[PDB]
Amino acid sequence: KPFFTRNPSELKGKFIHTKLRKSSRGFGFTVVGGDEPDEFLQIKSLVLDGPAALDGKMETGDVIVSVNDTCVLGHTHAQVVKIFQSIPIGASVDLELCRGYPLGSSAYGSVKAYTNFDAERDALNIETAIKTKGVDEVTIVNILTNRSNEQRQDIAFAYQRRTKKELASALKSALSGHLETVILGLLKTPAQYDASELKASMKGLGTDEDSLIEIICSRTNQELQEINRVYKEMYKTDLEKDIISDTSGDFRKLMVALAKGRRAEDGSVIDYELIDQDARDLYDAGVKRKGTDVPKWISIMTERSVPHLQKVFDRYKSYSPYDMLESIRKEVKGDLENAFLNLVQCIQNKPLYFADRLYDSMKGKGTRDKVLIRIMVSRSEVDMLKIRSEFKRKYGKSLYYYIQQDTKGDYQKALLYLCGGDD
């Protein structure tokens, strides 16, 4: 349960006092929370060109402590909104805000927002570590792996503002090897990281299909819209065109369909009749007949919602002697088969999917560092705790333990911080 108190003397972070004059379009910010009897009200967003943003003190996630010297900790959403609306135009409001409590963080991520966050202090310390004779990598790793992705963007902004140099460029020149790969990956936003991992996977027609498949099969609609937008910004070409240029056959049709990020959203009602019909269609399209009707498989597995397809795959076992994964291995081959196997795993149990990919990257000789690094970077704020839970349950030892055996040095220490702990 999120922390809550009605006493200001028990709040965690730092306090900001603001004075805003009401404009024609209000004070220019939105708030969330205050429905549960014990829930903070926090700043959801700030209207640009509005009083709150132009003042410069208010920030997203801040807890509203008091309004016009009345403490509003514990007050309902409706009571506080009424206070702001009753203020006439030109009158002012006095706000005390508390900065340190986060908003909208995943419950299953391993990397949490640092509470006493000071972007300027972090940039200063990173610069000192970069300029140290024989780079101080420990400080660089200790900081960046203990900050959320959003905070790393603030660190990079404060670093560029002080030194007039990009933080990623300075770290690229100071770090090397697998440690450099991890740190530079942490510095990108989730969409920037996936977009550049996708571009790298399509270096030629001899494509690292594993990486393309892994990203496109495991990303959600929301994540794929931002990837498609950011990919075109960074590389001035649509992601779909590069997939079309880099794939062929039914494998191409499947990757293009998934990358659109237009999967049907999770419905409120379970459609039991469509569940049975989809299961029969998957059976009729494959195991039941000679050959395979691949477009029917692509259509059902790319367009239906994930909760729907989980029940479809269970109902499919009623008609077919083999489950969906085994049916795929019997019906198709090559990149098409690998893509269907990854997609079905992502639908059925995405944390287990990443746990198996982590095991494969380390089990044998050496390491598939590219796979291991990308997963530890991209899932550390999504579902890393479920990935660790599935890993320890299946393999007996923790993901932490396997990372220790396969990697060494500051590289290992960074991966262990992204892991989050032993199991």
Binding site: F27, F29, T30, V31, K44, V47, H77, V81, Q85
Partner: peptide
């Protein structure tokens, strides 16, 4: 979620 309410605008102010």
């Amino acid at each position: 979620s309410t605008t102010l």
